[PDB]
Design a protein around this motif. Structure first.
Motif, PDB file in Angstrom:
ATOM      1  N   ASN A 151       0.741  -1.287   0.031  1.00 49.40           N
ATOM      2  CA  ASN A 151      -0.298   0.120   0.148  1.00 49.40           C
ATOM      3  C   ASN A 151       0.969   1.327  -0.238  1.00 49.40           C
ATOM      4  OD1 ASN A 151      -2.760   0.345  -0.287  1.00 49.40           O
ATOM      5  ND2 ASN A 151      -2.822   1.248   1.718  1.00 49.40           N
ATOM      6  N   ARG A 152       1.822   1.228  -0.368  1.00 47.22           N
ATOM      7  CA  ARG A 152       2.829   2.414  -0.732  1.00 47.22           C
ATOM      8  C   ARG A 152       3.047   3.074   0.402  1.00 47.22           C
ATOM      9  NH1 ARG A 152      -1.386   1.948  -3.419  1.00 47.22           N
ATOM     10  NH2 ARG A 152      -2.286   3.833  -2.266  1.00 47.22           N
ATOM     11  N   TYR A 153       2.718   4.576   0.518  1.00 49.18           N
ATOM     12  CA  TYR A 153       2.896   5.345   1.721  1.00 49.18           C
ATOM     13  C   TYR A 153       1.503   5.303   2.719  1.00 49.18           C
ATOM     14  CZ  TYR A 153       6.679   7.499  -1.044  1.00 49.18           C
ATOM     15  OH  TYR A 153       7.756   7.987  -2.017  1.00 49.18           O
ATOM     16  N   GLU A 154       0.633   4.581   2.164  1.00 48.77           N
ATOM     17  CA  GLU A 154      -0.656   4.589   2.956  1.00 48.77           C
ATOM     18  C   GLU A 154      -0.647   3.606   4.098  1.00 48.77           C
ATOM     19  OE1 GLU A 154      -3.419   6.786  -0.567  1.00 48.77           O
ATOM     20  OE2 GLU A 154      -3.541   4.824  -0.321  1.00 48.77           O
ATOM     21  N   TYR A 155      -0.101   3.961   4.995  1.00 48.98           N
ATOM     22  CA  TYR A 155      -0.097   3.414   6.322  1.00 48.98           C
ATOM     23  C   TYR A 155      -0.222   4.151   7.490  1.00 48.98           C
ATOM     24  CZ  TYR A 155       1.819  -0.795   3.378  1.00 48.98           C
ATOM     25  OH  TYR A 155       1.787  -1.878   2.627  1.00 48.98           O
ATOM     26  N   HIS A 436      -2.003  12.417  -5.971  1.00 50.12           N
ATOM     27  CA  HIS A 436      -2.106  11.411  -5.241  1.00 50.12           C
ATOM     28  C   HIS A 436      -1.312  10.137  -5.614  1.00 50.12           C
ATOM     29  CE1 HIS A 436      -5.837  12.933  -2.736  1.00 50.12           C
ATOM     30  NE2 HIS A 436      -5.082  13.983  -3.222  1.00 50.12           N
ATOM     31  N   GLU A 437      -1.138   9.231  -4.741  1.00 49.27           N
ATOM     32  CA  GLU A 437      -0.068   8.166  -4.919  1.00 49.27           C
ATOM     33  C   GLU A 437       0.951   8.853  -5.512  1.00 49.27           C
ATOM     34  OE1 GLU A 437      -3.470   7.893  -6.326  1.00 49.27           O
ATOM     35  OE2 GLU A 437      -4.103   7.674  -4.522  1.00 49.27           O
ATOM     36  N   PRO A 438       1.843   9.593  -4.776  1.00 45.30           N
ATOM     37  CA  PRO A 438       2.845  10.472  -5.229  1.00 45.30           C
ATOM     38  C   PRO A 438       4.126   9.896  -5.045  1.00 45.30           C
ATOM     39  CG  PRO A 438       2.375  11.333  -3.276  1.00 45.30           C
ATOM     40  CD  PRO A 438       1.410  10.110  -3.487  1.00 45.30           C
ATOM     41  N   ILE A 439       5.233  10.361  -5.572  1.00 40.15           N
ATOM     42  CA  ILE A 439       6.531  10.492  -4.760  1.00 40.15           C
ATOM     43  C   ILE A 439       6.362  11.199  -3.681  1.00 40.15           C
ATOM     44  CG2 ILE A 439       7.410  12.164  -6.395  1.00 40.15           C
ATOM     45  CD1 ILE A 439       9.473   9.450  -4.687  1.00 40.15           C
ATOM     46  N   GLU A 455      -0.708  13.708  -1.712  1.00 39.74           N
ATOM     47  CA  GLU A 455      -1.147  12.879  -0.788  1.00 39.74           C
ATOM     48  C   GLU A 455      -0.055  12.115  -0.187  1.00 39.74           C
ATOM     49  OE1 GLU A 455      -4.012   9.468  -1.513  1.00 39.74           O
ATOM     50  OE2 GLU A 455      -5.352  11.006  -0.363  1.00 39.74           O
ATOM     51  N   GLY A 456      -0.140  10.727  -0.378  1.00 42.16           N
ATOM     52  CA  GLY A 456       1.498  10.303  -0.015  1.00 42.16           C
ATOM     53  C   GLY A 456       1.517   9.805   1.469  1.00 42.16           C
ATOM     54  N   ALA A 457       0.184   9.434   2.065  1.00 44.19           N
ATOM     55  CA  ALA A 457      -0.158   9.120   3.381  1.00 44.19           C
ATOM     56  C   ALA A 457      -1.448   9.149   3.258  1.00 44.19           C
ATOM     57  CB  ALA A 457       0.278  10.320   4.313  1.00 44.19           C
TER      58      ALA A 457
HETATM   59 CL   LIG Z   1       0.769   6.417  -1.538  1.00 43.01          CL
END
Ligand SMILES: [Cl-]
Ligand SMILES: [Ca+2]
Ligand SMILES: [Cl-]
Ligand SMILES: [Mg+2]
Length: 662
Positions: A151-155, A436-439, A455-457
């Motif tokens: 889930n990338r940065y979204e934790y 959103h869903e960025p670096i 976003e990135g979170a």
């Molecule tokens: Cl993300």
């Protein structure tokens, strides 16, 4: 070699006595970073590791200031000492490189500068040897999210002993037993792979560069530099927040006159899809219709919002849009979304349409249409676009030059370059980008001021369906981790918290109503959404007045007090722009799952001026689980000599407008 902060409290020693070049850092004469290695390994080129010796040091310093076009503060002070340390290894398999260190009172940045030299041609970095060896790591506490996950940065953030943080994203924030807070991040991530931190021997965090699918990390031709590696150090948690080091390490604005970038507030056809009252795809419940968009634009014009985001306007959302990355059109609207009529209506109402480009991870399908898509938006009077890259970690899809699909990471060199291409192309159309869903943010908004937010979170959207939603502590975690990177599009302002039922076991923002208001001052972004359905704001007009009043662009910002994962208090002074005189101050405070009392001095207010504080706070009996809406709104005359007792409910908050009086 040694370099120190201007005040002398941070001291960096750069050495060649260890197996490789290395550095260490003390804070107030206590070591906080032990000997930490420097260098590179390459796929074919011989490594830059052991046997390099210091041949030269060049010392210089800076004491200057510069002005932001928009931001959390108008004037940024840059005061640092600087040293460039040159290393050389004799042949065979010799070489030379330099590391430039900048020491600020609030932290340090360093980067490698590898010059042109014989045999350094087309190279591929496979490992960056940079370490951050934390002293006394066995008694340190860290607040972190895992890297390389699905889930990338979204934790949500973990609270653990530092030795348990195995593989983590940055900003990576922790404190040692002395109470010193430290955060590791990077700045000016350009044409390079993002750094993840990989704990090797206990406390030794090694740079772990996010690779290409082929397995190498960074492709370069000849001489190259790395991004800056940053180590913020402060005696208090808020000292991390109040630093400008990330911006100061980026290059100055390259876009010239950026007065076409407009901070402001927006609403959107958006939350309805997340709570399932509308669909992104076509049908009886389609959100993105001409009629719905005009209804939102009327509301925006009446209540003072600059734009309306609309998702689901373009063909390709039907079915399960997560799997539709190959089929999205970025020029063809659904038949029930009349973009020419909405362009006319935007001029009649003064409310702009905010564009939306979701890729579902297929960046080649987007790239091939991107020029036509931005031309359409420029033709349609669209000035801001929200982009999206929804796909699991490591599952960006690109088509290579031979027509073969490859999977990439969102934070590898390939995507780092892809995001910046999108931003630069958008700037040619006078379009700003909300990714959103960025670096992760590394301060590039200084250089490219149309990269306004990301976003990135985990933001508000996880409170609609997160299962579980964000916990009460989430904001007070973000404030000292994610928010150290730069602005976040959190989409605050949910007024109906009851759409799934109240209590602690449903998908909803696990907060009080006043905490939703406080977010507009706690979480900086040049654009702030009022995320809820318009009718939910019409039901609470007194609370809604704060959202109508609050600016998004600040002459000054000060984190007054706080503790990671517990609470934070921000005071910010509005920037003079548009309808804002520049005289009002604003305050926001939030807590975690605990009710908290916080004593605040008002001595940030301008001396000799009277203010009317308009205080939006938790009601006496508020508590987030079953009584989140109890709210008190009070007016109180105050000056800088006054103080305030904040009484925050469980997952509560307070928002204040300090209205300067003539
Ligand atoms: Cl993300
Ligand atoms: Ca998202
Ligand atoms: Cl939250
Ligand atoms: Mg806590």
């Amino acid at each position: 070699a040694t370099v120190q902060s201007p005040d002398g409290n941070i001291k960096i020693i750069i050495s060649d006595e260890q197996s490789t070049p290395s550095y260490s850092i003390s804070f107030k004469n206590k070591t906080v970073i032990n000997n930490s290695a420097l260098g590179f390994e390459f796929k074919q080129h011989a490594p830059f590791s052991n046997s390099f010796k210091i041949t030269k040091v060049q010392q210089q310093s800076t004491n200057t200031q510069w002005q932001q076009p928009w931001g959390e503060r108008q004037t940024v002070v840059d005061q640092h000492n600087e040293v460039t340390v040159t290393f050389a290894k004799p042949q065979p398999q010799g070489g030379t490189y330099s590391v430039r260190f900048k020491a600020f009172d609030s932290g340090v940045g360093f980067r490698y500068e590898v010059p042109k030299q014989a045999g350094l041609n087309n190279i591929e970095i496979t490992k960056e040897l940079t370490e951050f060896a934390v002293n006394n790591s066995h008694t340190a506490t860290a607040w972190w999210i895992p890297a390389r996950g699905w889930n990338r940065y979204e934790y949500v953030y973990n609270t653990t002993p530092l030795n348990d943080a195995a593989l983590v994203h940055t900003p990576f924030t922790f404190k040692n037993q002395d109470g010193v807070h430290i955060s590791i991040h990077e700045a000016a991530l350009v044409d390079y792979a993002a750094m993840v931190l990989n704990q090797r021997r206990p406390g030794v965090f090694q740079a772990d560069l996010t690779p290409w699918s082929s397995g190498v990390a960074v492709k370069k031709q000849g001489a190259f530099n790395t991004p800056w590696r940053t180590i913020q150090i402060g005696e208090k948690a808020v000292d991390l927040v109040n630093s400008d080091i990330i911006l100061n390490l980026n290059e100055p604005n390259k876009l010239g006159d950026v007065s076409w970038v407009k901070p402001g507030k927006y609403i959107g056809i958006w939350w309805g899809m997340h709570i399932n009252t509308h669909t992104w795809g076509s049908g009886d419940k389609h959100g993105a219709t001409t009629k719905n968009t005009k209804y939102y634009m009327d509301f925006a014009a009446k209540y003072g919002f600059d734009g309306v985001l609309v998702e689901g306007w373009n063909t390709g959302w039907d079915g399960d849009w997560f799997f539709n990355g190959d089929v999205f059109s970025f020029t063809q609207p659904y038949d029930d979304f009349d973009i020419a009529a909405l362009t006319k209506y935007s001029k009649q109402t003064g409310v702009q349409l905010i564009g939306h480009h979701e890729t579902s991870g297929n960046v080649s399908n987007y790239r091939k249409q991107m020029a036509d898509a931005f031309a359409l938006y420029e033709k349609s009077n669209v000035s801001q676009v929200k982009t999206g890259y929804v796909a699991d970690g490591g599952n960006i899809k690109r088509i290579d030059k031979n027509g073969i699909a490859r999977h990439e990471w969102h934070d590898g060199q390939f995507m780092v370059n892809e995001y910046l291409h999108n931003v630069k192309l958008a700037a040619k159309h006078k379009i700003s980008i909300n990714t959103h869903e960025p670096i992760k943010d590394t301060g590039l908004r200084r250089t490219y001021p149309n990269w306004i937010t990301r976003e990135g979170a985990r933001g508000q959207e996880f409170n609609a369906w997160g299962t579980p939603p964000n916990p009460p502590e989430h904001i007070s975690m973000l404030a000292f981790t994610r928010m150290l990177a730069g602005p976040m599009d959190f989409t605050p302002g949910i007024f109906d918290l009851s759409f799934n039922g109240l209590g602690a076991n449903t998908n909803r923002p696990q907060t009080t109503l006043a905490k939703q208001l406080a977010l507009y001052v706690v979480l900086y972004s040049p654009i702030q959404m009022a995320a809820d359905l318009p009718k939910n704001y019409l039901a609470k007009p007194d609370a809604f007045q704060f959202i109508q009043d609050v600016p998004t662009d600040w002459q000054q910002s000060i984190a007054l007090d706080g503790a990671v994962g517990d609470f934070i208090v921000f005071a910010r002074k509005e920037r003079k722009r548009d309808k804002y005189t520049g005289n009002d101050w604003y305050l926001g405070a939030v807590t975690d799952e605990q009710a908290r009392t916080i004593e605040i001095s008002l001595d940030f207010l301008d001396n000799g001026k009277q203010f009317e504080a308009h205080i939006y706070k938790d009601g006496k009996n508020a508590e987030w689980k079953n009584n989140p809406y109890d709210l008190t709104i009070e007016k109180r005359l105050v000056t800088a000599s006054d103080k305030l007792t904040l009484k925050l409910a469980t997952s509560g908050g307070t928002a204040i407008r300090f209205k300067a009086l003539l």
